[PDB]
Structures are given as structure tokens and as C-alpha cells.
Amino acid sequence: VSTLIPPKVVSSKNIGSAPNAKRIANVVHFYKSLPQGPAPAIKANTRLARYKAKYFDGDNASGKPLWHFALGIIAFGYSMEYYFH
């Protein structure tokens, strides 16, 4: 009966659809992400932290300090042998 008008009804359409929820998720997801590996805190020491940073990161990740811990029990219990028997 007249010139009907759905070319411009986008302004209040852009809430209900599914990429709108993904869009408002990931524009929030992107800003607080640190850019290029920044603030990783690669240097730390608390009298036991260099042990962790040298041994217990994902780079080395070897169980040989447990060996040393086992050696520590060889340092401990055998000396407890010297304290008991």
C-alpha cells in the first residue's frame, strides 16, 4: 500500500542474534590479554624460588630433583641410621 521499510531496522536488531553474544564476549576477551608475553615475571627469588625456576618449570620439567629429594632422604634417613643404629 506504500513503500515498506526494512533496510534500516538494524539499530535495534543487533541484540538478539547469536554473533552479537559472541561479539560482546570476545571484545571483552581481547583487551586485557597481555600482548607479547609481557609481565611473565621471569626473575623471582624467595630462598626456594630459584630451585623452582631452574627445575620445576615446563621447560626442564625433569623429576631428577625428586632424585635429589630421594638423595635428601638418603641424606636424612641414613643419617638417622647414624642416630639410631
Partner: peptide
């Protein structure tokens, strides 16, 4: 506007206009 109304399929009365 027809080749841009490809972007809006189901125009009830604009194509009828």
C-alpha cells in the same frame, strides 16, 4: 537496491512497492 536487497530476503512490500 534489488542486488542489495539480496542482503534482506523476505521484503514483504518494498518489492511490491
Amino acid at each position: 537496491k534489488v542486488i542489495s536487497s539480496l542482503r534482506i530476503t523476505g521484503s514483504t512490500a518494498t518489492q511490491l512497492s
